[PDB]
Amino acid sequence: VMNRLILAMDLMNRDDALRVTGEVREYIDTVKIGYPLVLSEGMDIIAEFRKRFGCRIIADFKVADIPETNEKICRATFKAGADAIIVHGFPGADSVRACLNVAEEMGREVFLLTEMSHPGAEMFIQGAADEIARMGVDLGVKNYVGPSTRPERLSRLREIIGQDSFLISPGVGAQGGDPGETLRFADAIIVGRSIYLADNPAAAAAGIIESIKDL
Amino acid sequence: VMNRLILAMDLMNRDDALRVTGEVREYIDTVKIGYPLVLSEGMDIIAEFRKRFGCRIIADFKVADIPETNEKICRATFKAGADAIIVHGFPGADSVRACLNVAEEMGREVFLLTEMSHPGAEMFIQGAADEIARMGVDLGVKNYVGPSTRPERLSRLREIIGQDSFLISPGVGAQGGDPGETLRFADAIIVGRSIYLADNPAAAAAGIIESIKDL
Numbered sequence: 354v355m356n357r358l359i360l361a362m363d364l365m366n367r368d369d370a371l372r373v374t375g376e377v378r379e380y381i382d383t384v385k386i387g388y389p390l391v392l393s394e395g396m397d398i399i400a401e402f403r404k405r406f407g408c409r410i411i412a413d414f415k416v417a418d419i420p421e422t423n424e425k426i427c428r429a430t431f432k433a434g435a436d437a438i439i440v441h442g443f444p445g446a447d448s449v450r451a452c453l454n455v456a457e458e459m460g461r462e463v464f465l466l467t468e469m470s471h472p473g474a475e476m477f478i479q480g481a482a483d484e485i486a487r488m489g490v491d492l493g494v495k496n497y498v499g500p501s502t503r504p505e506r507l508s509r510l511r512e513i514i515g516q517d518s519f520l521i522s523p524g525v526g527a528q529g530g531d532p533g534e535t536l537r538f539a540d541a542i543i544v545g546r547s548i549y550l551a552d553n554p555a556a557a558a559a560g561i562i563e564s565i566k567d568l
Numbered sequence: 569v570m571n572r573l574i575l576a577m578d579l580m581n582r583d584d585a586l587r588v589t590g591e592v593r594e595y596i597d598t599v600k601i602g603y604p605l606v607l608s609e610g611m612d613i614i615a616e617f618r619k620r621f622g623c624r625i626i627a628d629f630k631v632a633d634i635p636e637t638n639e640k641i642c643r644a645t646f647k648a649g650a651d652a653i654i655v656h657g658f659p660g661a662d663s664v665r666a667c668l669n670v671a672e673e674m675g676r677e678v679f680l681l682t683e684m685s686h687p688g689a690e691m692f693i694q695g696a697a698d699e700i701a702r703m704g705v706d707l708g709v710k711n712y713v714g715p716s717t718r719p720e721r722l723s724r725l726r727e728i729i730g731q732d733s734f735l736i737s738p739g740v741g742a743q744g745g746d747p748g749e750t751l752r753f754a755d756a757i758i759v760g761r762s763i764y765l766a767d768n769p770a771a772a773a774a775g776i777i778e779s780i781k782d783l
Contacts, residue, residue: 365640388629389640392648396607417632417656418602419686419743425580425604433607441632443658445688471634473660477700481692488691528634546636 354541355382356562361545362386365393373554378406380558385543387413400434409436417441420451427455437462439498442485449492462496465489467510470500470524486513501530507538532564569756570597571777576760577601580608588769593621595773600758602628615649624651630681632656635666642670652677654713657700664707677711680704682725685715685739701728716745722753747776751783
């Protein structure tokens with residue numbers, strides 16, 4: 354991704370989302386759009402963004418249903434123009450395989466979320482994360498998501514998935530993660546609030562890139 | 569819930585969804601709407617259904633994000649008219665509390681999904697499910713979702729949450745679960761494909777209710 358930086362566009366109204374994304378477009382090539390924006394403005398916002406900014410769109414829907422419903426969610430999401438979708442691994446292998454089958458049919462990609470970045474992830478997800486990552490490898494998953502807030506866990510995840518897999522990581526900025534440290538293990542960092550709630554989003558994005566290039 | 573039966577309306581186009589829900593409305597008072605329909609037709613479909621059928625709407629979004637995003641998802645979902653939202657417990661207590669705080673602010677309800685009904689749930693979720701249920705009790709959750717496909721697990725979940733909590737259960741019909749056995753522990757059963765893919769959805773719903781009333 355351009356500059357190894359992915360914008361998590363979680364503003365909830367179209368006008369603000371369009372303004373901020375346009376202000377930082379020169380510093381990224383990939384926008385992560387999730388339910389806060391889609392449930393507020395509609396799935397058509399994905400194609401509008403993709404077209405208007407000529408960026409790749411990752412739908413961060415953290416898919417976590419049974420196989421049959423996961424297939425339907427992935428189909429609707431790719432039909433809407435998304436390039437990739439983020440799926441939870443904790444529901445198990447059949448749920449993840451359902452997403453991979455649709456991505457294969459539609460020429461898109463699946464990112465497997467292993468361990469989450471917030472405090473509560475320590476309760477149940479962390480203990481299963483190494484196994485979820487190994488399950489991903491066994492299924493042929495090549496794209497993964499891991500926590501910026503726990504670089505030692507990000508390192509262990511990178512260890513399991515190997516150097517050829519692509520790893521992106523949220524939790525930078527607002528949640529406490531560091532761009533530089535996270536990029537020791539992840540290929541790209543996801544940043545939301547530190548950029549979109551900033552008084553000057555372009556300056557915030559630029560400042561992060563400056564740290565990155567220095568690496 | 570009328571007849572202890574909740575329709576899982578997962579068709580993906582408005583016309584078919586409206587037709588089937590109208591055909592079975594005399595047998596239910598609650599419709600569960602999820603992402604297959606919402607991502608295909610828009611969040612406005614919730615208010616349309618609520619008005620048209622005068623039914624309660626449970627948004628089955630299996631929310632599974634960090635606290636901050638979960639709040640935004642719940643706010644957008646209740647703004648759209650949903651009476652309740654289903655939330656995953658696996659992500660931890662802070663993620664669940666974020667949903668409860670928004671439900672409290674907006675006068676709505678949160679249903680906590682403990683163990684899922686599909687085969688893959690055995691990999692990671694099942695082993696944490698009793699603890700997720702206890703966490704729910706500790707947080708003051710009063711509405712839960714458990715698996716029709718494993719009545720012995722449904723019994724154990726009922727044991728943890730007590731008789732006063734409300735428990736609904738998916739996996740009846742297509743996934744192999746039985747209405748009668750599931751209702752030994754759950755207050756209501758969720759049924760999707762067995763009704764909406766039937767040649768006569770009203771007859772399918774009626775048949776289920778007849779086996780229920782005989783309890």
